[PDB]
Amino acid sequence: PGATLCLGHHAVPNGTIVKTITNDQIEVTNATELVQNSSIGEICDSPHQILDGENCTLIDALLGDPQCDGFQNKKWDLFVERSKAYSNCYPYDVPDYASLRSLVASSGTLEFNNESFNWTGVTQNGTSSACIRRSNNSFFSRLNWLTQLNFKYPALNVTMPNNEQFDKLYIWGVHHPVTDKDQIFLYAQSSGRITVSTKRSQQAVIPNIGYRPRIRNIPSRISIYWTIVKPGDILLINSTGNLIAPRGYFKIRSGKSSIMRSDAPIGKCNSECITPNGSIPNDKPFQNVNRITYGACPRYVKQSTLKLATGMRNVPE
Amino acid sequence: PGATLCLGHHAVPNGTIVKTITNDQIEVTNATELVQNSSIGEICDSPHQILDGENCTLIDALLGDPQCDGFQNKKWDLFVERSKAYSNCYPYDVPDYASLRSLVASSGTLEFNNESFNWTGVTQNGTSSACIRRSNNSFFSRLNWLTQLNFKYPALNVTMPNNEQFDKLYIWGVHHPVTDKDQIFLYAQSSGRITVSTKRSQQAVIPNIGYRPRIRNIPSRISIYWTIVKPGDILLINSTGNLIAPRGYFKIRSGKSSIMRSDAPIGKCNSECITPNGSIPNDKPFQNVNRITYGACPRYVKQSTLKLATGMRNVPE
Amino acid sequence: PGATLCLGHHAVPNGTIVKTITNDQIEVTNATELVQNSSIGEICDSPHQILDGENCTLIDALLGDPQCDGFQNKKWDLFVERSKAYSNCYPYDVPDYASLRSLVASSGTLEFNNESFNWTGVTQNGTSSACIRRSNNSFFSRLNWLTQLNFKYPALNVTMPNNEQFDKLYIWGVHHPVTDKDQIFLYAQSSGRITVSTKRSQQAVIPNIGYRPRIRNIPSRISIYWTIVKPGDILLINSTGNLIAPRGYFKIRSGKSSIMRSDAPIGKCNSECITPNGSIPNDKPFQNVNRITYGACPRYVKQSTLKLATGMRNVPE
Amino acid sequence: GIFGAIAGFIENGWEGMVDGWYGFRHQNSEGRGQAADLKSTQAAIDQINGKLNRLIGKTNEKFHQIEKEFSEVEGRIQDLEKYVEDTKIDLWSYNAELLVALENQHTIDLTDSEMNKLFEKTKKQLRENAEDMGNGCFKIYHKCDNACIGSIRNGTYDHDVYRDEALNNRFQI
Amino acid sequence: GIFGAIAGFIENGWEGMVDGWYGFRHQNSEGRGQAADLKSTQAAIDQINGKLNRLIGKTNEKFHQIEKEFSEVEGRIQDLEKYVEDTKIDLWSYNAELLVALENQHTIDLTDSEMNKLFEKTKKQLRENAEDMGNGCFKIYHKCDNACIGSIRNGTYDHDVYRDEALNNRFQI
Amino acid sequence: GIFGAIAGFIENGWEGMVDGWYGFRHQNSEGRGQAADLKSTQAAIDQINGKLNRLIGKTNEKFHQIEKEFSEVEGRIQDLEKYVEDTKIDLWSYNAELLVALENQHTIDLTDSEMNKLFEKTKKQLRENAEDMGNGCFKIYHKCDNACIGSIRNGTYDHDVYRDEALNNRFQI
Ligand SMILES: *[C@@H]1O[C@H](CO)[C@@H](O[C@@H]2O[C@H](CO)[C@@H](O[C@@H]3O[C@H](CO)[C@@H](O)[C@H](O[C@H]4O[C@H](CO)[C@@H](O)[C@H](O)[C@@H]4O)[C@@H]3O)[C@H](O)[C@H]2NC(C)=O)[C@H](O)[C@H]1NC(C)=O
Ligand SMILES: *[C@@H]1O[C@H](CO)[C@@H](O[C@@H]2O[C@H](CO)[C@@H](O[C@@H]3O[C@H](CO)[C@@H](O)[C@H](O[C@H]4O[C@H](CO)[C@@H](O)[C@H](O)[C@@H]4O)[C@@H]3O)[C@H](O)[C@H]2NC(C)=O)[C@H](O)[C@H]1NC(C)=O
Ligand SMILES: *[C@@H]1O[C@H](CO)[C@@H](O[C@@H]2O[C@H](CO)[C@@H](O[C@@H]3O[C@H](CO)[C@@H](O)[C@H](O[C@H]4O[C@H](CO)[C@@H](O)[C@H](O)[C@@H]4O)[C@@H]3O)[C@H](O)[C@H]2NC(C)=O)[C@H](O)[C@H]1NC(C)=O
Ligand SMILES: *[C@@H]1O[C@H](CO)[C@@H](O[C@@H]2O[C@H](CO)[C@@H](O[C@@H]3O[C@H](CO)[C@@H](O)[C@H](O)[C@@H]3O)[C@H](O)[C@H]2NC(C)=O)[C@H](O)[C@H]1NC(C)=O
Ligand SMILES: *[C@@H]1O[C@H](CO)[C@@H](O[C@@H]2O[C@H](CO)[C@@H](O[C@@H]3O[C@H](CO)[C@@H](O)[C@H](O)[C@@H]3O)[C@H](O)[C@H]2NC(C)=O)[C@H](O)[C@H]1NC(C)=O
Ligand SMILES: *[C@@H]1O[C@H](CO)[C@@H](O[C@@H]2O[C@H](CO)[C@@H](O[C@@H]3O[C@H](CO)[C@@H](O)[C@H](O)[C@@H]3O)[C@H](O)[C@H]2NC(C)=O)[C@H](O)[C@H]1NC(C)=O
Ligand SMILES: *[C@@H]1O[C@H](CO)[C@@H](O[C@@H]2O[C@H](CO)[C@@H](O)[C@H](O)[C@H]2NC(C)=O)[C@H](O)[C@H]1NC(C)=O
Ligand SMILES: *[C@@H]1O[C@H](CO)[C@@H](O[C@@H]2O[C@H](CO)[C@@H](O)[C@H](O)[C@H]2NC(C)=O)[C@H](O)[C@H]1NC(C)=O
Ligand SMILES: *[C@@H]1O[C@H](CO)[C@@H](O[C@@H]2O[C@H](CO)[C@@H](O)[C@H](O)[C@H]2NC(C)=O)[C@H](O)[C@H]1NC(C)=O
Ligand SMILES: *[C@@H]1O[C@H](CO)[C@@H](O[C@@H]2O[C@H](CO)[C@@H](O)[C@H](O)[C@H]2NC(C)=O)[C@H](O)[C@H]1NC(C)=O
Ligand SMILES: *[C@@H]1O[C@H](CO)[C@@H](O[C@@H]2O[C@H](CO)[C@@H](O)[C@H](O)[C@H]2NC(C)=O)[C@H](O)[C@H]1NC(C)=O
Ligand SMILES: *[C@@H]1O[C@H](CO)[C@@H](O[C@@H]2O[C@H](CO)[C@@H](O)[C@H](O)[C@H]2NC(C)=O)[C@H](O)[C@H]1NC(C)=O
Ligand SMILES: *[C@@H]1O[C@H](CO)[C@@H](O)[C@H](O)[C@H]1NC(C)=O
Ligand SMILES: *[C@@H]1O[C@H](CO)[C@@H](O)[C@H](O)[C@H]1NC(C)=O
Ligand SMILES: *[C@@H]1O[C@H](CO)[C@@H](O)[C@H](O)[C@H]1NC(C)=O
Ligand SMILES: *[C@@H]1O[C@H](CO)[C@@H](O)[C@H](O)[C@H]1NC(C)=O
Ligand SMILES: *[C@@H]1O[C@H](CO)[C@@H](O)[C@H](O)[C@H]1NC(C)=O
Ligand SMILES: *[C@@H]1O[C@H](CO)[C@@H](O)[C@H](O)[C@H]1NC(C)=O
Ligand SMILES: *[C@@H]1O[C@H](CO)[C@@H](O)[C@H](O)[C@H]1NC(C)=O
Ligand SMILES: *[C@@H]1O[C@H](CO)[C@@H](O)[C@H](O)[C@H]1NC(C)=O
Ligand SMILES: *[C@@H]1O[C@H](CO)[C@@H](O)[C@H](O)[C@H]1NC(C)=O
Ligand SMILES: *[C@@H]1O[C@H](CO)[C@@H](O)[C@H](O)[C@H]1NC(C)=O
């Protein structure tokens, strides 16, 4: 009689379909998903330092819009800008807004050091009803609106050396009055001129007097500019009207900081990978949640699923 | 005696050489080409909507150069610009020409809506012998050359709100006269100034009076600019001379439209993939015809041939 | 009795660890390194034409800073800029410095042809104590500082046609005096204006009078600009003060030329691949020496080592 | 698969084998039974775990990058930012597709291989005492009780003990 | 190839086999002949068609992109546009080179495998009635006419029918 | 490895084999010895050299590119230049990692294969004159002196010469 000995392998009743080099559908005993396709719908506050912009854009927090006063000197790994954010101070624009936003985001700090600029012959601390702080007329916290004093505005020629071992970031502006009248009332001469310079740079701006469409009922504007001043270098403000002066400088750092547009709520949780949709687990090598990411994240791909076989070919009985 | 049974495989007398991991030349029974290396030398008019620029660049069709009048309000998937194209209206330049060309190309439409701008105190519809339309002096169809009326040019302060649910694209310009004389003859004052603004933007331009080298015997110029105005926003033209005014706006759409430089003739045929050399079949995954493509196309690679084995190793008798 | 015949394979006592699809550490009999991780610390002068900038940046060699006179008309495959380089002529800036540096680097030549510009009514060849050449006051070799003659500076309207079959590169500048006084002393009128134009372009510059922080004790500046003039086109300089005139043009070529920042010494040796660290052998497909390379080079990767198995699995006795 | 065992000469798998991936079924004088082979099972599992360790929990940190959504039409710069990102995503998407296809082909082949190795090992072990029936089964030409079958599964089967009995059974008329 | 059959122990292919990729040649009492094996042929063809289906007619649509030819010298921006495109093309060119090399190695190996599987299947089928001559041929140790050869090719050969005759022929002196 | 010979049924390698990669050890009436097999050795070496030729000394020339280090903060353009380069490097780094992993898996498998091919070839050669002991060794059931062993190694062994002697030794009681 003897015996029979058969060699074999397992199988399951519920196999999973995977792709190979030659087959776009072959059944294996088991597989695991390689594409993360969901988020938990909130941005975990850990382990990255999250700064929720709330009603403030980073630029508004920078300039010191009154609703953004709570942001002074704060740092972040990730600044989160909300789609509902809005400005509520003096209407302004920033040529190359995108680059200023980027370089501040990347710096990761709103650390501001006041400096005593020699403003002689002008009225300091100009305010407006378009920028209300604690029920009073006010202005951007980091900016100093200079106007005429005793119907004069003499020529400014103010120097500020950088004797630090870090770069200094200066934010300053030009006011564009609505009328030749308003121009004289504010600065005593018909034509403003601002020159901001360093050893290695010079930015010259002439105001443009005229009407713009009203924003929050204001038809005038401020244009915002920036200047970086390195160690051993010097900031020179050579102006004859219309200057919105810096009160000091922002530190610029380097590191891992960024900014992200998202309306996802901040949660009390811990997740390495942030997308605008919310934090995502990072166990999988790939993800199709969002091309925008921050932290230790799976790589964005177009596929919604990629199944890695973790077992043999399934050959049911 | 018994029998002999031999197992074997086919072979061919004319094998093909392919590459593997270990061999850059190994013969297999058959192979197929993966790199598309030829075009049919014409751009098929189907299935994409082709607009042949003929003598017109897209920008000339946009401005309304007289030879481009047949292009009014046309749409395209692909605008084809010919190397022989030339301008034959008032000589002009466009700062960031490349971006305007790109954004119009991508929009995919020349749809233009006239608007009734309040031009009071100036002579409208200025024409020139440098822009001949139907044997008369003329001008760009979409532009309105404003000049003095009764030796005066008063200050314009003209508003146009966007109450549509689409963006509006405005094209406008500045005329640079050749002499201080010509300046006064046209605009009644020595210095022009144009300010075009919205809630979220402001562009200020001063003309530069002076000679340029002649183009089609004209030593003066027009500089062309654009402004996009979103829903709820307003266009403000605040000018005192030298304005080349818009007559209206172009719609800006989004979708699959583009532009391509090619001298290939348009054919009556159907091909998904367009290159500047002509349409190419898209059966193969790769192609070395042109890095420039439009539509469902093989990916550009440097190799002129890549042979995929479709049979076994060939071992002739 | 009979015999025993055993089939087998070699092994070594000193195997090497490699990675596979399934194992990040498996021992094979032999392997070869695929990542080049070292340089010889010098840039071989062969086979590429190396031009060592020494104390000169490419832009200083271009303008003709006196310490850079030995660079006149030289060509390079690779221009090497040293971190110790410094300017020692009239202090200047270049808007889009990076693009001018790039286009000259890429052109690969400092070939300069003098041209006889019709400068009538002005004093040519202005010099300064801020640009010492052979113990005398001097200026940039390729630039011609034009100033008033007989307390007049008449309106210049100077033409130079390109009747060559190559493009011409023109370098020119604007002088910014420190005072309204110095302005009149140099150019006879309070306001300079420069217009440089071609058929297809126009650049207009107004000087900005004012103080800048001192560089080598000079508080004035020159701003440098460039203009390319194609065959059949014409250069027009239409100026009324403050022009730093070209003396001619640079040829612009195309080819394989570039520029690299490095402090590695030049050696008398032969190596195809140059990095800022020094030349590297190019036998390996990859390298982690520097992402910056020139010539036939391994591709930069992040790994410091990648071992390719060149033998079987090692199974010691 | 490339070895021809799984979904090949082995007609099908065994759903009732839940304590291993490969193994043995027998019939002899004392009944019929199943036992998992742990070594082959572990060899397959170790290799699959090796892959997984190269792909799971190994993500890469990025911080400040470029913008990838835009609220205004800008032209050239934005075209470039969008094209860079689209380029990147398509390359990674390709990498992911290829990776999974290659990994999966390889997983099927290596698991087929392990089945084949176990079969080959058992065939050699049995020497002249059994014949291959072509379907993964050996006809063993001698009495082989439970301890005997166990000895085959455990690598302690001494073919010389049974050889005379087996040869007589194999080569009879 | 990795199995050692095609361009290995099988000395060469058969140019006169035009109705299949693998098959059988025999010599017996009634002559010599050739027949294709359809199953192995189809197994190879199906796999190659599977690859082809993953690569032919599967192109990707792109519309507005960046410019890639330039009529003016511009510097920084153009350097970046050119570098992005050169980067992309080199990555795709690499992908294409690798893909074809891997696919082709695999095609050669899988076709070698199918040859090997058919050989192995036939070897097991013949049991003790034939011996492997080492060159893909079996010496069958019994009378095996055309119907007999057909039965081997069709999987209906009953080795027990011939075993006595074959053993006597094999193990004679 | 995927064939199960190297680090499989062959227990270990031979450190004392320095004139080839694969070979033969024997014991017979005249002693014990070792000889390299040149054909299998060369087959492995040729394949590995083929890979190497596809990767060593094959670099690509680039000239003017983009800047990759920056002395000033600039924002948008620099963000893009840095991201393009980081993108590129990560893609090439991935390509290099994958390439080496695949190449190395393949090298191990092909070398395992060659060992297996040599074993199989020798097994078939010996016909009914030897049996596979399961560890890469054959018990040869006849007197096989040095010239006889040489004949096996050189492919001139005539199995018919020894078959009667071997069958008698194999199938005795
Ligand atoms: C199908 O294939 C997949 C992938 O191979 C397989 O999933 C894996 O299962 C194991 C065991 O169930 C998982 O391991 C666990 O992971 C969790 C989460 O990370 C850990 O918390 C667990 O740790 C505990 O348990 C350990 C012992 O198992 C303890 O040693 C430890 O101290 C903890 O108490 C544990 O490691 C593994 O995460 C998954 N892998 C993936 C990628 O999902 C699945 O089981 C297979 N399915 C079948 C039906 O076989
Ligand atoms: C070498 O290898 C290649 C690739 O495997 C192989 O080329 C293929 O050949 C087949 C058959 O000749 C082609 O299939 C045809 O394709 C055309 C064009 O797309 C179709 O019009 C055909 O459709 C008709 O025929 C079908 C039956 O064959 C009908 O069912 C159908 O209704 C139509 O009447 C048909 O599908 C295939 O396109 C090529 N593939 C490639 C990539 O070229 C070639 O034959 C092999 N050479 C040798 C000598 O074996
Ligand atoms: C481990 O694996 C590696 C890679 O397979 C292997 O390294 C290779 O060794 C050979 C021989 O030692 C090298 O070939 C030499 O290369 C040098 C430098 O390029 C040449 O100068 C040599 O040319 C001379 O010698 C030839 C004959 O060998 C003559 O024909 C010729 O005219 C010259 O006189 C020679 O080609 C080869 O470069 C390396 N490859 C690499 C990538 O390093 C190494 O030997 C293996 N180690 C062991 C212990 O097996
Ligand atoms: C130049 O044109 C601009 C744009 O049309 C003119 O601006 C408009 O000025 C009027 C005058 O006050 C503004 O009206 C005010 O609106 C507010 C808000 O509803 C209302 O509370 C006030 O009672 C008043 O009606 C109008 O909003 C404003 N329009 C825009 C778009 O800004 C401007 O008057 C012109 N300038 C000159 C000098 O002629
Ligand atoms: C400033 O310099 C410019 C550039 O050199 C001068 O432009 C030139 O002006 C003359 C005067 O008419 C032009 O001549 C004309 O050419 C046409 C075409 O061939 C011909 O038909 C006319 O009969 C006449 O000869 C000349 O083309 C023109 N050159 C260029 C390059 O534009 C200009 O005159 C100077 N301006 C002043 C105010 O001095
Ligand atoms: C506007 O402000 C600028 C910047 O502060 C003033 O520049 C400064 O001018 C003084 C006057 O000579 C310079 O002093 C000189 O320094 C050199 C070098 O050490 C020394 O050898 C001389 O004896 C002299 O002391 C000073 O360096 C310079 N500072 C800078 C930063 O450039 C300028 O005076 C002001 N202009 C007007 C018109 O008021
Ligand atoms: C995460 O958010 C992104 C961006 O909002 C979502 O992607 C968009 O999805 C909407 C609606 O399905 C589409 O109209 C857009 O075209 C998508 N944009 C892009 C860029 O893909 C995405 O669906 C969200 N994913 C998850 C998992 O929540
Ligand atoms: C952010 O802004 C919103 C809207 O401007 C604020 O919500 C309003 O707050 C006012 C003043 O207390 C309330 O009267 C309203 O009930 C709110 N309006 C709406 C539409 O929600 C919100 O409080 C601000 N948040 C922060 C954190 O400053
Ligand atoms: C398609 O057109 C392109 C671009 O004109 C051709 O590529 C050029 O070919 C010319 C002449 O062979 C070369 O001088 C250029 O250097 C090529 N340019 C580039 C960017 O590669 C190409 O040959 C054409 N291909 C086909 C199949 O017609
Ligand atoms: C595009 O422009 C070309 C050249 O300007 C036109 O061809 C000329 O047309 C004129 C006027 O009828 C003829 O006298 C000439 O025979 C043509 N010259 C040349 C050099 O070809 C052409 O007609 C224009 N095409 C379109 C579609 O407007
Ligand atoms: C080649 O030079 C580069 C650049 O200087 C070196 O990379 C830097 O190394 C320093 C010190 O180890 C680090 O602080 C920097 O972060 C590195 N920079 C980058 C961009 O990686 C590199 O170490 C040198 N390599 C060799 C082999 O000499
Ligand atoms: C490059 O510049 C350096 C520093 O300016 C020069 O070195 C100095 O040369 C002076 C003048 O002969 C000497 O008195 C000093 O000994 C040097 N100083 C230092 C700090 O090294 C150098 O000679 C210049 N090189 C070239 C090639 O022009
Ligand atoms: C298959 O079914 C079993 C039985 O319920 C279940 O436990 C297992 O998780 C399933 N596995 C897969 C991969 O679907
Ligand atoms: C700079 O300041 C000096 C001294 O106050 C003054 O003469 C000059 O006009 C100023 N320059 C500008 C551009 O305002
Ligand atoms: C080989 O030759 C035959 C006979 O003419 C031909 O039909 C076939 O298409 C050729 N195939 C290849 C791949 O060259
Ligand atoms: C704008 O229009 C108003 C009213 O006509 C006028 O006073 C003002 O000067 C204009 N502004 C410009 C810049 O032309
Ligand atoms: C291993 O050791 C030998 C003996 O000295 C040496 O010659 C050889 O180069 C070594 N090989 C490797 C790859 O380490
Ligand atoms: C200017 O200098 C050049 C070069 O030294 C010389 O040839 C020319 O005569 C000078 N021109 C004048 C007007 O002095
Ligand atoms: C150009 O030159 C002419 C003639 O000399 C002069 O009238 C005109 O003012 C100049 N233009 C400029 C911008 O200097
Ligand atoms: C074989 O091994 C099993 C597993 O532990 C053991 O229980 C059994 O007693 C062994 N049988 C023989 C016959 O060696
Ligand atoms: C084997 O199959 C072939 C193919 O159809 C058939 O024609 C033949 O009659 C069969 N022969 C035997 C002996 O079963
Ligand atoms: C086998 O080949 C070897 C290698 O050259 C040779 O020296 C030897 O004489 C041969 N032996 C026999 C028995 O053929």
Residue numbers in the entry:
A (entry chain A), B (entry chain A), C (entry chain A): 9 to 325
D (entry chain B), E (entry chain B), F (entry chain B): 1 to 173
What does the paper behind this entry write?
Influenza virus hemagglutinin (HA) engages the host sialylated glycan receptor at the receptor-binding site (RBS) to initiate the virus life cycle. Since the HA RBS partially overlaps with several major antigenic sites (Wiley et al., 1981, Wilson et al., 1981, Wu and Wilson, 2017), egg-adaptive mutations can dramatically alter HA antigenicity and reduce the effectiveness of seasonal influenza vaccines (Raymond et al., 2016, Skowronski et al., 2014, Wu et al., 2017b, Zost et al., 2017). Based on sequence database analysis and virus rescue experiments, this study revealed that the two most common egg-adaptive mutations on H3N2 HA, namely G186V and L194P, are incompatible. X-ray structures illustrate that individual G186V and L194P mutations have opposing effects on the HA receptor-binding site (RBS), and when both G186V and L194P are present, the RBS is severely disrupted.
To dissect the impact of the G186V mutation, a crystal structure of IVR-165 HA, which is the triple mutant H156Q/G186V/S219Y of Vic11 HA, was determined at a resolution of 2.25 Å. IVR-165 was the vaccine seed strain for the 2012–2013 influenza season. The HA structure of IVR-165 was compared with that of Vic11 by aligning their receptor-binding subdomains. The distance between the 190-helix and 220-loop in IVR-165 HA RBS is slightly larger than that in the Vic11 HA RBS. Such a difference can be attributed to the G186V mutation, which causes the 190-helix to move away from the 220-loop through an increase in the side-chain volume. The other two egg-adaptive mutations H156Q and S219Y have little, if any, influence on the distance between the 190-helix and 220-loop. H156Q abolishes a hydrogen bond between the 150-loop and 190-helix, whereas S219Y stabilizes the N165 glycan from the neighboring promoter of the trimer by forming a stacking interaction with the glycan. The heights of the RBS of Wy03 and IVR-165, as measured by the distance between OH98 and Cα190, are 9.3 and 9.5 Å, respectively. In comparison, those equivalent distances of Fin04, HK05, Bris07, Vic11, and Mich14 are in the range of 8.5–8.8Å. Overall, our structural analysis indicates that G186V increases the height and, hence, the size of the HA RBS.
